[PDB]
Write a protein that binds this ligand. Sequence first.
Ligand SMILES: NC(=O)CC[C@H](NC[C@H](O)[C@@H](O)[C@H](O)[C@H](O)CO)C(=O)O
Ligand SMILES: [Ca+2]
Length: 241
Amino acid sequence: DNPLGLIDPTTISVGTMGDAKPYAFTTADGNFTGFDIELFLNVAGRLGFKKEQVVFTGQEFSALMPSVANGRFDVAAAAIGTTAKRKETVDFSDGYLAGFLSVLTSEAGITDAAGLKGKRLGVVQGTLQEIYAEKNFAGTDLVKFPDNNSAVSALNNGTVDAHFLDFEAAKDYSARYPALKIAVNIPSFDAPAGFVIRKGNDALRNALDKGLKEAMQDGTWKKLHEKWFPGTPMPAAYLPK
Ligand SMILES: NC(=O)CC[C@H](NC[C@H](O)[C@@H](O)[C@H](O)[C@H](O)CO)C(=O)O
Ligand SMILES: [Ca+2]
């Protein structure tokens, strides 16, 4: 049978993204990796699904939740912030990561949120960054990008003054392009990352939640967090109790 309500009962089809390093990304061989991928794989194993039974498809961020809602994938995993607005379209698992939205700029760029008034700020279409900047960065010219790589290329070229993306990805790009630096950190603890599932696949949602709680309780979450986000604080909520 099919208790988890999957497209194929023998395989879990996961929608993800290739350029949200270190949450979710492709290595040079094309394989999907990163914290969110390794955490999902660990949770999927607890559900009785081996690595070979989980298939990852890379999509632009804006395509992920409509793809799950339209039955193209069973799950979506790509640091997808849990919000009321997104809960109208899709269901979410319990939160597994809460952190900052970050403004990445050039070596002689912006210093604070005030510095963004009248500047060109890059954003990935469909992200929480795009909503935040529309509500809190009025006067900043928002330049929409399909993904992080194109936005960083524009930032490196001087097309845009800054780029608004997730903290760990901003941190990763500042390591890959040493001239880049994080100028502003905005709290996004009210929107923790959750695995996205079809409205309302209660079986898969409850199964994902159980696997997540287990991975946090046995220190698996802690181990992956230490591996992918070195130096980032881990709250007691996601650590063993
Ligand atoms: N580009 C992406 O993959 C996702 C970007 C963006 N992530 C927001 C995060 O989920 C943020 O709210 C979290 O608190 C945390 O820092 C990482 O999941 C979003 O959901 O739109
Ligand atoms: Ca553009």
